[PDB]
């Protein structure tokens, strides 16, 4: 009686939101950006190849200086690279080799990683002893750690396969806020540039926008047909793009609270692993299961170019803060640095 | 062309590469085993004989270092991380023979033995384990014999025309799992009957792994 009545009210509320989004769907982003000229063909060459990982690379993250990056592989090795020289700055042996994510702190003093061990481990890069040591192990998730991102040297947000995200106080080792509401494994998260919000994509094919301080879900974005594996905020923080196993990338708007554009091709039938934007946001770069990275026109949904330099899955990618280059990590155990030439 | 600190930084990177190579060579020599099986299948008892996320067991037997990975504690989506174990030497699958007449606790309408069949079929025919051999432990053999006298296999297998002897009942169950192998040429299934009092379970894994290693070498050279 009461349960049946309540679940009927949820359906009425869902229709109310769907009608509200349809009311403000006056135009399409495709129609708006029809007049602007295309970006042309985007040609990028492999400037650097980072060799030394001996297993599948699962994650990479640039440091904020646009020169150092950290990559994680399931050979149990965290490597910090000097991308300008390809020198290895550090090699951090992981206690658990089943790493799935890694993050570089914006200060450059810490890196974080974690996987099937259900732990987010914090590593101190600047010690008087001259070696990288574990500074914190964040326990509390009951599923694998899928993504982690620093807010500062003391706070980090983690998404897990136990359907929840958490905000952690690194010094006390406790999760201050728990973000619940996903019905599937949360596979990725992205921080807004002001670090007041973050979006997460789960296996319920939905993306939720969370308030960091308040700790609740502000908006829910649907439209994917399969698990979301990747997510990335637009550079101004007013939009984000997702990548799913349905071979599509979608651009959702925060303020319009709906999808704006879909990035898919008929030839593309493989899942998407990673998404990122160029510095101006005009380019959407996506890594795929078909060993390739497709550069999309974000505004016009045109495939601008292809980065074809890996013999296995493109598992991760990232664009530097200065926008100079893009790094691609792959299951073939290599990282590549790409940019164009005049 | 390089400064004094640039040369020192390059030299430090060279030392890291040497250490990465040594660790990789050591890892390649170890034997990786993915330990699978449903709950209450005797899988925990197997670990003790072999002496909140993933549990790793390390043991040495006849100069061979084994790394056994237990993933039963993980309750998340299997398809999001099962590819992480692509490349293990072999998969150890545990099936409790005494659960043929039991009913799954959660479902209350699914046979416990039939629950392992769909788990075995998914793992055996998984795309990430096309060329991976499977070691099948049929546990609770002493308890299975006791239950056979009281409860026949007709409850578990309605279309069973065999007798109720201990040898015939166990052999039929073994053939049921091996028939689920949709790729009988790329991979092989090694079946062993285990018990809580058995002490030859480690030897069987060593023999099965040694056979897998030999066939891997023959296939790598292109002989197969």
């Amino acid at each position: 009686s009461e349960l049946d009545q309540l679940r009927q009210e949820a359906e009425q509320l869902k229709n109310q939101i769907r009608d509200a989004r349809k009311a403000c769907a006056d135009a399409t982003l495709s129609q708006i950006t029809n007049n602007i000229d295309p970006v042309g063909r985007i040609q990028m060459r492999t400037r650097r190849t980072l060799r030394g990982h001996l297993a599948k690379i699962y994650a990479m993250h640039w440091g904020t200086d646009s020169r150092l990056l950290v990559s994680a592989s399931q050979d149990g090795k965290l490597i910090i690279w000097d991308s300008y020289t390809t020198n290895k700055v550090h090699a951090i042996p992981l206690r658990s080799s089943w790493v799935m994510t890694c993050a570089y702190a914006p200060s450059g003093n810490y890196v974080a990683c974690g996987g099937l061990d259900n732990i987010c481990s914090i590593y101190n890069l600047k010690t008087r002893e001259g070696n990288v040591r574990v500074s914190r192990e964040l326990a509390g998730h009951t599923g694998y750690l899928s993504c982690c991102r620093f807010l500062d040297d003391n706070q980090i947000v983690t998404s897990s396969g136990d359907t929840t995200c958490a905000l952690w106080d690194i010094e006390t080792g406790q999760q201050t806020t728990t973000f619940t509401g996903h019905t599937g494994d949360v596979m990725s998260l992205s921080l807004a540039p002001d670090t007041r919000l973050f979006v997460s994509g789960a296996c319920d094919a939905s993306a939720k926008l969370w308030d960091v301080r308040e700790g609740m879900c502000r908006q829910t974005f649907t439209g994917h047909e399969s698990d979301i594996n990747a997510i990335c905020f637009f550079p101004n923080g007013n939009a984000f793009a997702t990548g799913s196993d349905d071979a599509t990338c979608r651009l959702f708007d925060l303020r319009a609270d709906q999808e704006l554009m879909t990035y898919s091709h008929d030839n593309i039938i493989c899942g998407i692993t990673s998404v990122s934007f160029s510095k101006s946001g005009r380019l959407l770069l996506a890594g795929y299961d078909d060993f390739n990275c497709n550069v999309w026109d974000a505004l016009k949904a045109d495939r601008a170019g292809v980065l074809a330099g890996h013999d296995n899955r493109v598992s991760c990618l990232g664009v530097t803060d200065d926008g100079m280059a893009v790094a691609t990590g792959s299951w073939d155990s290599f990282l590549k640095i790409w940019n164009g030439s005049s | 062309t390089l400064s004094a600190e640039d040369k020192a930084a390059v030299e430090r990177s060279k030392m890291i590469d040497r250490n990465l190579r040594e660790d990789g060579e050591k890892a390649a020599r170890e034997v990786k085993l993915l330990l699978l099986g449903a709950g209450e299948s005797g899988k925990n008892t197997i670990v003790k004989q072999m002496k909140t996320g993933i549990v790793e067991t390390h043991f040495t037997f006849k100069d061979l270092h084994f790394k056994m990975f237990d993933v039963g504690a993980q309750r998340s989506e299997r398809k999001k991380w099962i590819h992480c174990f692509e490349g293990v030497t072999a998969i150890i699958f545990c099936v409790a023979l005494s659960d043929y007449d039991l009913v799954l606790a959660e479902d209350e309408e699914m046979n416990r033995m039939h629950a392992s069949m769909k788990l075995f079929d998914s793992i055996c025919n998984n795309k990430w384990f096309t060329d991976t051999s499977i070691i099948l432990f049929l546990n609770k053999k002493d308890l299975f014999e006791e239950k056979i006298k009281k409860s026949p296999l007709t409850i578990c297998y309605p279309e069973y025309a065999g007798s109720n002897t201990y040898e015939e009942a166990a052999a039929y169950i073994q053939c049921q799992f091996e028939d689920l192998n949709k790729r009988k040429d790329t991979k092989e299934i090694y079946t062993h009957f285990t018990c809580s009092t058995d002490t030859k379970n480690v030897q069987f894994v060593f023999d099965a792994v040694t056979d897998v290693i030999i066939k891997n070498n023959l296939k790598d050279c292109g002989l197969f």
Epitope: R67, R128, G130 | S3, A4, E5, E11, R12, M15
Partner: single-chain antibody, 231 residues
Framework: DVQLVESGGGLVQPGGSRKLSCSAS????????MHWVRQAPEKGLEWVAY????????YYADTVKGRFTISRDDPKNTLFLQMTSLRSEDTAMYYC??????????????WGQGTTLTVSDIVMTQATSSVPVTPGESVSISCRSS???????????LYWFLQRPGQSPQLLIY???NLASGVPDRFSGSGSGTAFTLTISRLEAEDVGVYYC?????????FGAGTKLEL
Amino acid sequence: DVQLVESGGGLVQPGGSRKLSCSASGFAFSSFGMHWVRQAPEKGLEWVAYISSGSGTIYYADTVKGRFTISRDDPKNTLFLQMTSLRSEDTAMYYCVRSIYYYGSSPFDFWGQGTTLTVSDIVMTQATSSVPVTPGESVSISCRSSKSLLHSNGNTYLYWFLQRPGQSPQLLIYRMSNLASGVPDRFSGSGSGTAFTLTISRLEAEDVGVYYCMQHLEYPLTFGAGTKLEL
């Protein structure tokens, strides 16, 4: 805590041999390159030798090459300096210095207390030998180099050290602008090409001492004469 203890120094006869030891505790010794730096009595710092992490690269100063041998024992965390044919020119306090080299590292960050031995090229110029100072007032120290210390990679390999009376040198500024860990922000390093300035805003009693500018552009590492601050 990070420690570097030297031993084996003492009065030796001319033409003799002596073995200096540097025991390291509290840090990953095998990860750091090691230098021997000596300081003649009432004189400035002079670099002696360098052995890299992993013992693959070894450098010597010309005045000691062929007579000194530098070695390390990584399992024992000991740095060695085997000296032969010791001359009266070798009478100095010998310091054990750790230095790690990667992008953004701070070489020469920790020095040992030193052991005293008594026996019976880019030019770095610090023309101002002494500077009278008063607490709370801003002080500038100048350094010059015969060659440009700015490399084509953008680094300017100039270092600033402070040796307080009775103490071992401590790193203040590395690569001409970066502030060493544990150093107050009042110290600031400014330079261009061959001319460099160390500015000390709001001078305090602790800042009193001798200041050395060192180049790390190439071997042999050379020190300036040193500028002394006095009240």
